[PDB]
Amino acid sequence: LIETVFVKNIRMLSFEDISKATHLPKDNVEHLVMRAISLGLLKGSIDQVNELVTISWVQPRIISGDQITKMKDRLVEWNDQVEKLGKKMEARGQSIWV
Amino acid sequence: LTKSLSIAFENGDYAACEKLLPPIKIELIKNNLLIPDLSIQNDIYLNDLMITKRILEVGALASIQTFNFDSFENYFNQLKPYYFSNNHKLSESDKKSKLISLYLLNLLSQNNTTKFHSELQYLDKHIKNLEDDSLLSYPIKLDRWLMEGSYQKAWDLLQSGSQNISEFDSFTDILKSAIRDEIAKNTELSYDFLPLSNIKALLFFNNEKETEKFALERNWPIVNSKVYFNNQSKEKADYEDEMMHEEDQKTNIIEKAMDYAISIEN
Numbered sequence: 001l002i003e004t005v006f007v008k009n010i011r012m013l014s015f016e017d018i019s020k021a022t023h024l025p026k027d028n029v030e031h032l033v034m035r036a037i038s039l040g041l042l043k044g045s046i047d048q049v050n051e052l053v054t055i056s057w058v059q060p061r062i063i064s065g066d067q068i069t070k071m072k073d074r075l076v077e078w079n080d081q082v083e084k085l086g087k088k089m090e091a092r093g094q095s096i097w098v
Numbered sequence: 099l100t101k102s103l104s105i106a107f108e109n110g111d112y113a114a115c116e117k118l119l120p121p122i123k124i125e126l127i128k129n130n131l132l133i134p135d136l137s138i139q140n141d142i143y144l145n146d147l148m149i150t151k152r153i154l155e156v157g158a159l160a161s162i163q164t165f166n167f168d169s170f171e172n173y174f175n176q177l178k179p180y181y182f183s184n185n186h187k188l189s190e191s192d193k194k195s196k197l198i199s200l201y202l203l204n205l206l207s208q209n210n211t212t213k214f215h216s217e218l219q220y221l222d223k224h225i226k227n228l229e230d231d232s233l234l235s236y237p238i239k240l241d242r243w244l245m246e247g248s249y250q251k252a253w254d255l256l257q258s259g260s261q262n263i264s265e266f267d268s269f270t271d272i273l274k275s276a277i278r279d280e281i282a283k284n285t286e287l288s289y290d291f292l293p294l295s296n297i298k299a300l301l302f303f304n305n306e307k308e309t310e311k312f313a314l315e316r317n318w319p320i321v322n323s324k325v326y327f328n329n330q331s332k333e334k335a336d337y338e339d340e341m342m343h344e345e346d347q348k349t350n351i352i353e354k355a356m357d358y359a360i361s362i363e364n
Contacts, residue, residue: 092353093360 001036005055015051100149107156115160122153129153136183148188151180155193162200162265174201195233198225200265202237207272214241236262240273249281253302278302282316286327294323 004021005013018029033053036042043057090097103122106114132146154173161170177197181189198221205214218238231238236255243252256277259270278301285292285300292300298309313320317330 089352089356093356096360096363 001032002041005042006058006061009058011056012052012054015053018053100153103153103156107159112160112163115156116164116166119157119160122157126150126153139184139187144188154180155197158197159265162268165268170204194225195229199233199236200269202234203240203266203269203273206237206241207269207276209276211241244277244280249277253277278312282312286331290326290328291324297325 001018001022004017008017015026015029018024018032019026022029022032024032030046030048033046037044041059042055044053044055046053103115103118106118129146129150133143133150154177158170158173158177161167161173174197181194183189202214202217205217221234226234236259240252240255243249243255256270256274259266263270281301294306294309298306301309301312303309303312310320313325319326319329
């Protein structure tokens with residue numbers, strides 16, 4: 001369960017994903033979802049009406065090499081945002097900056 | 099020679115009218131010089147001016163039937179100040195009413211209502227009142243029903259045009275194609291999916307095949323003989339929205355704040 005959850009970083013998973021991976025009946029599925037939550041391994045809430053688990057928190061694990069690069073790619077993008085935004089806004093209402 | 103042209107119309111060759119016109123255009127300098135160009139009007143000059151108008155006039159009618167717009171319009175430019183002169187010279191004619199009618203239909207076919215109404219405002223005094231509406235009723239009413247929203251009425255005028263064609267069909271064709279487009283656009287937002295029978299009936303097509311021709315040109319999927327308007331039109335709209343014009347007219351929420359603050363502090 002921890003393996004399936006970590007790879008799909010999207011914020012929602014149907015019960016059907018869990019059923020197939022662990023090969024269990026659906027009765028047992030929602031209990032297994034209660035256990036993870038009790039461990040604190042995972043945090044989130046359970047929708048029984050739509051049969052969803054909304055995962056809202058993942059617990060950090062061993063950061064592999066591939067992931068070092070992934071982090072870096074996003075940080076450049078977010079460098080640029082700060083950079084673009086400060087430069088234009090200095091120019092706007094340049095006259096007053098006492 | 100002014101009678102060489104004259105007879106060229108009665109003969110009924112408007113291709114003959116066309117090939118003869120360019121030698122006369124040098125001659126039409128000479129006609130201009132005969133009149134002192136309205137510095138003083140006398141009855142000798144009333145006669146001289148009658149010939150000039152007649153020449154320009156037979157040339158104008160020719161261009162509409164040979165479908166050459168450019169020449170028609172130019173002549174028309176001249177023709178107006180020629181007709182408007184003083185209070186009444188010998189401007190009043192059967193052709194006067196007829197020529198106005200055509201001009202207005204043209205302006206509607208260009209899908210330029212701006213100028214249509216402008217031209218209408220010019221007419222709306224003396225001339226429209228004295229001649230009543232009897233050939234004018236054809237463009238006034240056409241333009242009027244398209245504004246009103248009653249398309250059925252706007253269509254029937256186009257169809258009944260048949261008893262009067264002599265040069266009017268050259269506009270009738272252009273105007274129709276634009277009317278079906280108009281209908282299609284209103285009905286885009288109204289409803290996404292229409293039965294096959296209703297798409298045809300609305301647009302007043304004679305045939306189903308013509309309907310599917312207009313879909314393909316319009317970039318709309320036909321799926322189970324039902325048109326779908328929603329997809330492409332929305333995408334296109336999105337793409338159109340992004341240009342180097344509408345970027346300074348958006349106004350960013352952060353930008354609004356700056357401007358409010360600094361105006362106090364100036």
